């Protein structure tokens, strides 16, 4: 079957520079595992994204349906939603800017959360 | 007494039974619309379902294929027995011969020769089974001058459960 260990090994085979995997406790109603991946260039991002999906389809998953690929249009962020894991693939420099790992590793202590600001919306008169 | 007399069709000289073959058409039933309620599946989904009760469904008159329509024969079935006090003698006379109390509605069902059933045979909700899709046709609610009261048919309705009692 297609599981966490197989995909990361496949990611290593295609030479993923940086992979982040965050488990989710049962209380939080989201995917059990959240995965973030780095890739040198958009061409590498396209290649690795295709490889995982092709392996996923080949590696059983018959009960599960085919998985659509999200973000292929973007050259810096591609994300594929599998049954038990979600892999978010981006460039190395793009990785630090978004800091997805901080969001999940620090559930409420992520620095970027504070960066959000508020506004006021008065009427003309 | 009349209902009990007609309870046993197989013990009242039943007409010959024929085997099934492709292209056979079974008779339909007349039921009363009790109401609607939600129904749940093992998948956790909630499905609104409508309740239909079959009341005093009996075969009344058989029409031969040639004498009714060259394409296929038809069978008349009526349910929902009604009072005899405020009806013309002609209607009572026909039902007296059949040995059954008068029914509210007479409807005609196209049935193949192999599926023909002797008149007076009691029909029960068990004819249909859960998992079978069925077609229900009924007169729409009348709204008065503004309408309605027109026969319409709904197709492709699945059966979820049947209450035998």
């Amino acid at each position: 079957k297609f599981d966490i260990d197989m995909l990361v090994s496949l990611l290593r085979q295609e030479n993923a520079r940086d992979i982040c995997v965050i488990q989710v406790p049962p209380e939080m109603r989201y995917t059990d595992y959240f995965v973030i991946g780095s890739g040198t260039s958009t061409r590498h991002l396209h290649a690795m994204v295709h490889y995982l999906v092709k392996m996923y389809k080949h590696l059983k998953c018959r009960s599960d349906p085919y998985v659509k690929i999200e973000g292929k249009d973007a050259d810096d962020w591609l994300c594929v939603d599998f049954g038990s894991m979600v892999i978010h693939l981006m460039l190395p420099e793009t990785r630090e800017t978004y800091e997805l790992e901080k969001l999940w590793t620090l559930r409420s202590f992520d620095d970027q959360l504070a960066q959000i600001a508020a506004e006021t919306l008065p009427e003309d008169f | 007494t009349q209902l009990t007399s007609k309870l046993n069709p197989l013990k009242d000289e039943p007409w010959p039974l024929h085997p099934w073959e492709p292209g056979s058409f079974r008779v339909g039933l007349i039921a009363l619309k009790l109401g609607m309620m939600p129904l749940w599946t093992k998948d956790g989904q909630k499905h609104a379902v409508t309740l239909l009760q079959v009341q005093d469904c009996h075969v009344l008159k058989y029409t031969p294929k040639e004498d009714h329509n060259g394409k296929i024969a038809a069978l008349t079935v009526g349910g929902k027995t009604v009072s005899r006090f405020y009806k013309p003698d002609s209607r009572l006379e026909f039902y007296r011969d059949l040995g059954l109390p008068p029914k509210q509605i007479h409807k005609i069902f196209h049935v193949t020769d192999n599926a023909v059933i002797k008149p007076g045979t009691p029909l029960y909700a068990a004819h249909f089974r859960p998992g079978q899709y069925v077609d229900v046709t009924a007169k729409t609610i009348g709204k008065g001058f503004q309408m309605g009261n027109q026969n319409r048919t709904v197709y492709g309705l699945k059966v979820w459960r049947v209450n035998t009692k």
Partner: protein
């Protein structure tokens, strides 16, 4: 919810959304076959005199049973490339967006708060 006009609260850290402005951020178009925009439906929001696509994450319209009704309309900005304009989302975001048809993984990844 968010529709033609329907001044919405921009729940994002995007520069245009984050910066205060005298006119509220309204919507100009709903990216659906129907004209009604609900949670998970792309919209053409307006911010700081600019037109930016936004993703609806909450609405005040009565919803189906077993779901929480939001008291405010919340949206998330999305770039043309499909990546979210903002890097974080402050308001709790329903997790049903994952199962909703479309590309929602990027926004969910950016949404730390899930209800």
């Amino acid at each position: 919810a968010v529709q033609k006009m329907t001044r919405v609260r921009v729940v994002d850290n995007s520069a245009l959304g984050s910066t205060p402005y005298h006119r509220p951020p309204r919507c100009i178009h709903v990216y659906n076959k129907s004209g009604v925009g609900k949670v998970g439906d792309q919209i053409l929001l307006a911010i700081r005199g600019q037109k930016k696509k936004a993703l609806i994450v909450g609405h005040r319209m009565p919803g189906s049973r077993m779901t929480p009704k939001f008291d405010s309309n919340n949206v998330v900005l999305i770039e043309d490339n499909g990546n979210p304009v903002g890097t974080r989302i402050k308001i709790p975001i329903p997790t049903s967006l994952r199962r909703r048809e479309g590309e929602y993984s990027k926004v969910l990844a950016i949404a730390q708060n899930f209800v």
